[PDB]
Every structure is written in C-alpha cells, then in structure tokens.
Design a binder for this molecule. Structure first.
Ligand SMILES: C[C@@]1(c2nc3cccc(C(N)=O)c3[nH]2)CCCN1
Length: 350
C-alpha cells in the first residue's frame, strides 16, 4: 500500500476525482452524452477559444446579428450543450465571452487531468494513489499544524479574511509544502529580482492536477482577452479574500484548494483601472492593481527575502480605484515559485 501520508493520499483522490470532472461539465450544461469526458481535446478547445475571440471582435465592431448568430452556433457545435427547448443563448456581449472562456480554461485543465489519469501503465503492481501521485511531478509534504510555517500561514489567512465579505468563514484543514519538477532552476535566475512576495492564487479544484503537473500558465494567443483586466498574465492577491473567491465552493462542496506562491515582482507598474499591458514599461517587471483594501503594512513579515503581507486588512491611500483588493500580475512563468497548497473548508453563514 501507499507510503504517502494520509492527508496527501486524500489530496490525490481529490484532484484526480473523475466525478468532479463530470460534475463541472454538467454544471456547464454540457451534454456528457455527446461530449463525454474522453472526447475533450486540446485542439477542440483552441478552436473554441478562437471562436470566442471572433465574437469579441464582432461585439466590439457591432457586427450584423447574423455574423454573431453563426459564431454562436459554431461554438455550441464545438461544445455540445443541452437545453432541450428555449434554444442556446446568443454570445453578444463581453459578458458571455468572459464566462465561456473561463469555462474553456477549466475544461482544458480537466482534459489534462483525465489525460494524465489515463496515460501511463495501469499495472496493479503499485496502488492508484502512488501512481497518480507520480503523474503530478511535484514533491508534496505535509506541514505540521504546530510549526511556525503553519502558524505564519493560518495568520495570513485569518488577518487577510474579514467579516466584510463574510459570506463564509475559513478553516484550514491541511497545508502542504510543494516543489514542482524544475521550479528550482527556472526560478533561481528570476529570484535575482527584488520585491519577492508570498501571494495567494485560488482556482477550481478540477484545475489542480493541471496546475501541479504544468504550473501556472498564461492564456494562449487565441484566448480572448476580455476578463484579464491587465492582460494575459498570472494573477495573485495578498488577501486570501480575493483569491478564495476563485475556488468556486458552495454549501454543497464547501472545501477547496488554494495556492501560496513566491512571486519575484521586481519593479511594479501601479495602476488603478484595467489596462491591457503584457508589454511593460522599461524597468517594470510586474503590474500591481491598486485596491481599496490592503493588508496593514506595519504587520508585514519576512522570510529569505520573501515578504509575507499578512497584515490585518485596512483601507488604502487611494479608494478612487476600481479595485476592492490588490492584484499582482507577472507575464513570465519563471517569476513564480509555488510553495504551498492548502485544503480549505468554507463555512457559509447563509
Ligand atoms: C484573471 C482572473 C483572476 N484575477 C485575479 C486576481 C487576483 C487573484 C486571482 C486568483 N486566481 O487567485 C485572480 N484570478 C479573473 C477571473 C479568474 N482569473
């Protein structure tokens, strides 16, 4: 039987859960009859992303209703949905294009998980757990509840989470220390960059096999840009509040996963409203979206040069921002070093 700790074994079961894959699809109104799990394909997804982009273009120019009707139909031909009656919605706004793309990113990470899950030898020599654990190519270790690491973390979560957006309370079930294959070398260079911070990154749990296996990625060129306030990059937050909302949990499934990554920010190009960057000003190596709420600066703590902004949570200098919280975007995957993964339980106040 498996050598991995219990909590780790349970983490594997979680991310490699097939029923979760199906649930995510059915929750997208996807006909699993026509578009079964094993039918998903990278290529089918690039195509869908490209249709999505065309829609945005059509939406921006003000295309002639029929062009938006064929683009809409082209999308539902690619991604088979079930409505029965009423008919499929028209994709005629930045709003629908953002939802559909978000769904494609998720569906793509699910294709990756089902594909890893299937690839490799299925010889019962070793148990499913240890095997599927190998597939992630990252070293996972439990962090003891009573370690300074855990304490630092729990405090970061409590301080940066407030009664304001208190729709739920957060319980840290497990925290893991993680080191992906090749994150030690790829980062070593970018580490020679100042302003290194330990930030949050929340994502749906169905995306975790794909995130650990391939790392955080930047949207493909065919992806529409609507939805990326500061362009195609990797986003983080310094308040568990902002990230936790991307875990998409509910009273039905109240437990989610969230990452803590060390990101070498360099000089930050500060902005208050959306701006499609990607091409930064000289001397800038990251973008910082200024929010209304910041963790209290005085309480910031350190580590090997990695600042942990675990300050409680206060109003910031500028409120004339379109942001409730801060955002941090880097446009190079090498500027990211994932260090911890946390299993969180959401207790909704409802
Ligand atoms: C780009 C977008 C995103 N923006 C973020 C800002 C801070 C943190 C995160 C995160 N993933 O924790 C963000 N994710 C928008 C909707 C889904 N992805």
């Amino acid at each position: 039987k498996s050598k991995l700790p219990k909590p780790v074994q349970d983490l594997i079961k979680m991310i490699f859960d097939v029923e979760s894959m199906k649930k995510a699809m059915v929750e997208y109104e996807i006909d699993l009859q026509k578009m079964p799990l094993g039918k998903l394909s990278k290529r089918q997804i690039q195509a869908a992303y490209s249709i999505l982009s065309e829609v945005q273009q059509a939406v921006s120019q003000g295309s002639s209703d029929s062009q938006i009707l064929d683009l809409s139909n082209r999308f539902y031909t690619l991604i088979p949905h079930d409505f029965g009656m009423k008919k499929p919605p028209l994709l005629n706004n930045a709003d629908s294009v953002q939802a559909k793309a978000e769904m494609l990113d998720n569906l793509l990470d699910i294709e990756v998980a089902y594909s890893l899950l299937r690839g490799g030898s299925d010889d019962s020599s070793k148990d499913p757990i240890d095997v599927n654990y190998e597939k992630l190519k990252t070293d996972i270790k439990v962090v003891d509840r009573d370690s300074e690491e855990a304490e630092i973390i729990r405090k970061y979560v409590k301080n940066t989470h407030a009664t304001t957006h208190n729709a739920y309370d957060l319980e840290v079930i497990d925290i893991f220390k993680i080191e992906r294959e090749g994150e030690c070398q790829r980062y070593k260079p970018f580490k020679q960059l100042h302003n290194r911070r330990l930030l949050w990154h929340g994502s749906r749990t169905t995306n975790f096999a794909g995130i650990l296996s391939q790392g955080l990625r930047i949207a493909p060129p065919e992806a529409p840009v609507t939805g990326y306030m500061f362009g195609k990059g990797i986003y983080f937050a310094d308040m568990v509040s902002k990230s936790a909302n991307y875990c998409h949990t509910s009273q039905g499934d109240p437990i989610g996963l969230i990452l803590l990554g060390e990101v070498a920010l360099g000089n930050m190009y500060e902005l208050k409203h959306a701006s499609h960057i990607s091409k930064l000003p000289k001397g800038k190596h990251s973008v910082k979206g200024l929010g209304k709420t910041t963790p209290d600066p005085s309480a910031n703590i350190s580590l090997d040069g990695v600042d942990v902004p675990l300050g409680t949570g206060i109003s910031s200098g500028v409120n004339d921002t379109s942001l409730l919280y801060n955002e941090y975007i880097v446009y190079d995957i090498a500027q990211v070093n994932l260090k911890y993964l946390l299993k969180l339980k959401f207790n909704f106040k409802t």
